[PDB]
């Protein structure tokens, strides 16, 4: 049953992004909380454009977590309505857009915008933006477990077949995994993002709040990443 | 094929109840002091014992320590054999302490002499009422999640559970590192990553990284990490 000693999948190919700090940013400027949230999609679009030029291929971005449901009804409804603007900002861009997470919990207004945004952009050969909306690492690992159990029940596989590669092919976020993770907002934790996929990722935390995160901030993170690899082997 | 996450569990929380520890920086430390390659490794078990003593007094209840990873097998045979022989010291160092000691990881890959020492160390200390030290030896987060998955699959095949039972609590009970999860993770050695340690369990853990190499990590360094932890604001996704 056991055996472990005897492949896992300059510039980082895949960047993961935790877009934290939006509320504090607004509250600082005497603004209402919602003003902060309004910068999310525009900023992300702007970041995709900068990254696309640098040669980055994938960005996975944390927009809403399975724990975010615990916020006030007011705040939640506002965020889930706001995410409709994903269509406007991306539908006519050069970016290919996928969503990961539990779609069925979201308003049908939002469900339709998402499906449409995916359909319209599915052909773009540029940067692939993955938006994690109603997502969690616990959820990802559990839905992969259920899917593997179903396969074993239907005679498709044996317990001896269950390995890293098999499990990887059932997760919503797949190889190649993030080379670098950037978390804005000053906190040093992963908050139930891509738990499996971050096993060997480099972590970069900045105190810069997400709405102030610009090209200069990004280029710094990448510079820091390249210094880590000079002393890594 | 049906998901639902909307109406929902976490195993967290002055003092951190559970500290996870990545012990990095041993070879650099020796090479700096002009000592032998493996001189750094010789500080592991002593330091751990010392850290348990300090932590135990402070009111900490659990320490999980990363001693050997699934990726460490790729080091030289010389270095590997030395480490695996050195882990035999676990019995001497802990057997007569007040500390309860468990090992997580794939025990069957290890030399039988090591397997026996481990089982003995576990048996002797299983009754102690003080601090629980978990030593991750031949462990990885990928391995932990996979062995839990196989166990769940076997049960479903034998009619002992169905797919609608598979949830966070179920999975927690099948993993080798269980609730309560780490409140704080300390990584010595200056690098900022988790290197396939407790992937599932670190979901809401606070991370502290220090440039201090592990052999120089002492009581003052530890109290600093704890002080840093106590400043932090944990929201767990709320406001
Ligand atoms: C809701 C999203 C997209 C990210 C988190 S930003 P937030 O609303 O959690 O803001 P604060 O962390 O409270 O500043
Ligand atoms: C606990 C283990 C596996 C090793 C000791 S730390 P190390 O050997 O990796 O030290 P360096 O990072 O090589 O200085
Ligand atoms: C992870 C543990 C237990 C010790 C260090 S093993 P390593 O020094 O090769 O680790 P990294 O690959 O540098 O993260
Ligand atoms: C970035 C997103 C959308 C979610 C994770 S950040 P959060 O503020 O919900 O997380 P914490 O409460 O700081 O753990
Ligand atoms: Mg936040
Ligand atoms: Mg090292
Ligand atoms: Mg492993």
From Swiss-Prot, chain A:
Q: Name one GO molecular function term.
A: dimethylallylcistransferase activity
Q: Where in the cell is it found?
A: Plastid, Chloroplast
Any GO BP: response to cold
Q: What is its EC number?
A: 2.5.1.28
Q: Which Gene Ontology terms of cellular component type are present?
A: chloroplast; chloroplast stroma
User: Would you say which domain of life the source belongs to?
Assistant: Eukaryota
Q: Where is the active site?
A: 20
Keyword vocabulary terms for this entry: Chloroplast, Magnesium, Metal-binding, Plastid, Transferase, Transit peptide
Q: In which tissues is it expressed?
A: Expressed in leaf trichomes and stem trichomes.
Q: Which residues form the signal peptide?
A: none
The protein's required cofactor(s) are namely: Mg(2+)
Write out the catalysed reaction: isopentenyl diphosphate + dimethylallyl diphosphate = neryl diphosphate + diphosphate
**What task does this protein carry out?**
Uses dimethylallyl diphosphate and isopentenyl diphosphate to catalyze the cis-prenyl chain elongation and produce the 10 carbon product neryl diphosphate.
What family is reported?
Answer: Belongs to the UPP synthetase family.
UniProt protein name? Dimethylallylcistransferase CPT1, chloroplastic
Q: Which organism is it from?
A: Solanum lycopersicum
Q: What part of the full protein is here? A: 53 to 299 of 303
């Amino acid at each position: 049953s056991c055996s472990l000693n005897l492949k896992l999948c300059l510039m980082p190919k895949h960047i993961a992004l935790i877009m934290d700090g939006n509320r504090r940013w607004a509250k600082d400027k005497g603004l209402e909380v919602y003003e902060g949230h309004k910068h999310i999609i525009p900023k992300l679009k702007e970041i995709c454009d900068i990254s696309s030029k640098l040669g980055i291929q994938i960005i996975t971005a944390f927009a809403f977590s399975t724990e975010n449901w615990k916020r006030s009804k007011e705040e939640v409804d506002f965020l889930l309505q706001m995410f409709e603007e994903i269509y406007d900002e991306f539908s006519r861009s050069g970016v290919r857009v996928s969503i990961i997470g539990c779609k069925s919990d979201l308003p049908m207004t939002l469900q339709k915008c998402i499906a449409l945004t995916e359909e319209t952009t599915k052909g773009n050969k540029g940067l692939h933006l993955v938006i994690a909306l109603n997502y969690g690492g616990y959820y990802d690992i559990l839905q992969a477990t259920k899917s593997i159990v179903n396969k074993a029940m239907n005679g498709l596989l044996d317990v001896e077949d269950i390995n890293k590669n098999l499990f990887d092919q059932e997760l919503e976020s797949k190889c190649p995994n993030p080379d670098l993770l950037i978390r804005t907002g000053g906190e040093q934790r992963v908050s139930n993002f891509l738990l499996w996929q971050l096993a060997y990722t480099e972590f970069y935390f900045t105190n810069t709040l997400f709405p102030d995160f610009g090209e200069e901030d990004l280029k710094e993170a990448i510079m820091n990443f390249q210094q880590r690899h000079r002393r890594f082997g």
